[PDB]
Design a protein around this nucleic acid. Sequence first.
RNA 1: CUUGGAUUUACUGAAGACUAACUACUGCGAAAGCAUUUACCAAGGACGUUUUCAUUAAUCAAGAACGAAAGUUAGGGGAUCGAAGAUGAUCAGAUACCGUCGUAGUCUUAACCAUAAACUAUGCCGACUAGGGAUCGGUUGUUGUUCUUUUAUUGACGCAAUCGGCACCUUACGAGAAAUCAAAGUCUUUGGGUUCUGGGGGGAGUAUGGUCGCAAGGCUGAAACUUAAAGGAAUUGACGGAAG
Lengths: 214, 127, 98, 25, 81, 91, 96, 153
Amino acid sequence: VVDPFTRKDWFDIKAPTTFENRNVGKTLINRSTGLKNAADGLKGRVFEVCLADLQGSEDHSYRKIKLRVDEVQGKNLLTNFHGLDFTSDKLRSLVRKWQSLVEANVTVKTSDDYVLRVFAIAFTKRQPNQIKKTTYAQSSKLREVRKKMIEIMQREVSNCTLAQLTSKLIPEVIGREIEKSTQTIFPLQNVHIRKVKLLKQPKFDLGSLLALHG
Amino acid sequence: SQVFGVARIFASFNDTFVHVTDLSGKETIARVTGGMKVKADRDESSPYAAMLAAQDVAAKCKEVGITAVHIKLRATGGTKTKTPGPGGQSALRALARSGLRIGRIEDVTPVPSXSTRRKGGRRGRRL
Amino acid sequence: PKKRASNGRNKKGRGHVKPVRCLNCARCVPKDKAIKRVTIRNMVEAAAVRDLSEASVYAEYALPKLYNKLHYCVSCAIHARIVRVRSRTDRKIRTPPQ
Amino acid sequence: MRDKWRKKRVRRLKRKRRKVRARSK
Amino acid sequence: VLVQDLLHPSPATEAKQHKLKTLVQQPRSFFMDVKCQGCLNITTVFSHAQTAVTCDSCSTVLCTPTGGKAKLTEGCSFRRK
Amino acid sequence: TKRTKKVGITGKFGVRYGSSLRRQTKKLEVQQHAKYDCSFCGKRTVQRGATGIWNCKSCKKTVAGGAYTVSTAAAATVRSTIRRLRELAEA
Amino acid sequence: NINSKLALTIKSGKYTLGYKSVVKSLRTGKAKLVIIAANTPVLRKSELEYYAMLSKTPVYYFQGGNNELGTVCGKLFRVGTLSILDAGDSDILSSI
Amino acid sequence: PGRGAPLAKVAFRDPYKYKLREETFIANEGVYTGQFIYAGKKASLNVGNILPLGACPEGTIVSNVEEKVGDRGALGRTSGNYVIIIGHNPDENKTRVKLPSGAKKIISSDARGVIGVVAGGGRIDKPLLKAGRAFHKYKVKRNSWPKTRGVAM
RNA sequence: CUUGGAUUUACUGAAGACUAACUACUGCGAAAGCAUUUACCAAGGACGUUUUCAUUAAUCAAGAACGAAAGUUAGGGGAUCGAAGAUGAUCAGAUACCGUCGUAGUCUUAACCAUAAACUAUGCCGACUAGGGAUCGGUUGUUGUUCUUUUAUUGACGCAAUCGGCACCUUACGAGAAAUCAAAGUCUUUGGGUUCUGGGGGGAGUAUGGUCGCAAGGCUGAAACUUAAAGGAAUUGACGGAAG
Ligand SMILES: O[C@H](c1cc(C(F)(F)F)nc2c(C(F)(F)F)cccc12)[C@@H]1CCCCN1
Ligand SMILES: [Zn+2]
Ligand SMILES: [Zn+2]
């Protein structure tokens, strides 16, 4: 009778420049009218898109990125980094019996007042010549690993902006820094930054958003 | 290129939901349930009802402009079962064979990191 | 008589073990006594693998697996044939079957 | 009677004797 | 074994034993002359020392206690007394 | 000798008002009339004047407090927070 | 550790206890260390450390109250302040 | 008399003439005679200090809080009570608080409160026990006691 | 419950609980019990020790501390499940099982209560008696190993010894009515120390007196009378809305 889909307009999502492939996709919303503009009814939407589709490599298939629109230019939506998470399957495939799991998180503010919660995860590594069934670290070793995780996450997020942090998240620089820093404690494997959570945004600077789009 | 939506399939043991949105999920494209395709409550979760619902969803997506869908599959989750209901697979297959193109697939079942008390009491459901 | 030297659970050297809820009936069963099965399954039935390969916009997309750990009480475990009643000498066998 | 429910019966029986005789201390 | 010499255990077996379970209990600790590269004198240190032992004018710490044997510091040799 | 078994200070009320009300009274009336250590001079000479007013006979300082004890639990948590809220700020 | 060092001074050193005695030991310059309890009034505390500056005497701020300082010195009475005149066979003076 | 909470007499210098100003405050628990009290926008977060609600972080306990800016105190004034700061809305210059009754309210961030809990808390935990205690209670409040039941008339 | 938009979907917020996966024939504690991070506080076993004291010890009527869950009192909290209650089914009837709600309760702070198949249904201390591979903690000697860093006093792993612990497998000399047992052995070839408990089945953990408790109850605790078995472990059969 009505077809609400007759009154819809389509818009193009755009990723920031920190990612390779920027044409994320398309969304739709009612046409802008006298009462409600489409822009403000559309600013603030969040899109979850796989990192593999953003970069063009299946090596990033297990991470997915949240992109939040905060400016509309004609038919383009300018989105910014809104968070990182693992797919459920990858996280389940990592967690396994006969080995220790060690986890840490920290709340840290970027160089440009972006407040984040960062979650690191790691598992004890089995040595090539090992004969014993289990690979457990004593609780003190896990505590020291956790301390290293937190202080490196602190250092690497505090001394950079949200865009530089987005650039750092892609090649797992923090993960490799954790792996290197904890070799002398206990061999570790699958050291990941498994989740990044955006707790606070600062005052919106439109000019800095445009700097990251084209 | 393709225009992607997100097919959000909620397959419980009582029903199956074939629900396509846009990428944000804030706009519904089509929503059809297994219970729309049968006249009996007992087979609202049947694979055949799920496949019928998936075809009708696929037709609606075709006429709207959706040409492909990513897959978000969930069980009931929470304190309830984590195993997907029987219609989820048939709905997934019908979507893939309907002409829509397929993107990523993920399981999004709600999983507690421990939780509230599940119903049924200490001695369980006594059948 | 005493049927099992382990009392039908796995608690030696501790007092109390917290319960878990049976998947089937939601009965409270001690975690050491619960019958537990680790399952890793293909998310798509092996029949629809080719349909979903044909319909994929990607080429060489690795299909995700389903991971789940299942907990049963004794009643539901026996009822659904996760375990079976064994003979008196066979009960002692603890290695997994083949 | 499932020995447990016999004790509960004596509990109730003994509870009522506590009230009959309290009429007289 | 039904016939065995309990008065003369073979020295290898007797050496594998706990210190309190030989025919006559005996310590496995010892005293050692330790030289430090800075000085030329010698100090007498217990093998399982519990004290971070100092010395004369070159009062550099010579050992640090652990759960068992004392860990000799970087650049100190020892000779068993 | 032990003059009463359980009434203690509420023995001034005799047999009246009910045992539960007298027992509830005893808890707070004991705390009401007790001597508390002064946090200023360190002597156990703090006594109640009226509800919420606690005076030290020795150093003559008065502090606001609870109705029947010098300090209430809600007040203590507030103090613990503030003195914590600056230690972590300096670090 | 500080309490044990001070405790050994009391057993084998020379000291005087109490505010009036401390002020005298500062005027005669016989004081080697002044210790002030945490609940000492700020007025008396700032007077004592003004005397200690005139006589070039170090000041230690004991973290317990006058009740706890008196116990640390082996006394059954409160001590609001004391001065060490001779450290005895202790390294209290070199360790503050 | 008539009040469960003690009062604090606090002296201030007059900024504009050579003269001493005395103020009557509701005493929070822990305030002592001789203590220095700080009131203003830049005042530190200490028990007994008077601060704008916008200057207090979330979770702060505060009493004698102003409903409107400058009314000199309306909320959380009786013994043992207080007001909790719930959240801030800096763009609107509004603060959200929780009242003793459980109600939640939005107040201007320029309204003031006194850090801490009102002293004298716990009065009602002890039974009055006697008609005479109630008589002495209302002897300094108003003529509201004893009460004749309506059905007895 | 839903065209007054249910269910479903995305974003955001608020509350109480709880601490998944990792998680084990693994750890700790007197037992009850104990599982997110960090900091602080005081304890602890084991190990190491050519340190110290020198019999200070074992077990214990009386007497004390702690003691799951439920339950009690007073404040606070009350998401979720949920005794009572309400209600839909089923049924010959079900005030039951199953469905939907839901009070107390579930949580916390001050006090109580003192009980569980509180179980290893197995008192505590001490000595001795047989083979085996694993594992947790400490210590001691030693690499075809991975890694700092190229190497030490990196770390992980690997190989041996040892003390302590949670256990397990085989045997059966021995024990036992047997089931089974590394103690439940060293017991008619009957004696290392010591505490507690039982004496056919019921009546009955009842009555009464005492005592503790706010109460619910806990502890102590008979007799009249009644009765030929009750009971344990195993065997063959039969039966099973058990399995193959
Ligand atoms: O929001 C909380 C909070 C509580 C309390 C208390 F309940 F004790 F009164 N007071 C707080 C205060 C206080 F009022 F200044 F004491 C400030 C900020 C936070 C407070 C927490 C307490 C731990 C530190 C972070 N704020
Ligand atoms: Zn079950
Ligand atoms: Zn005083």
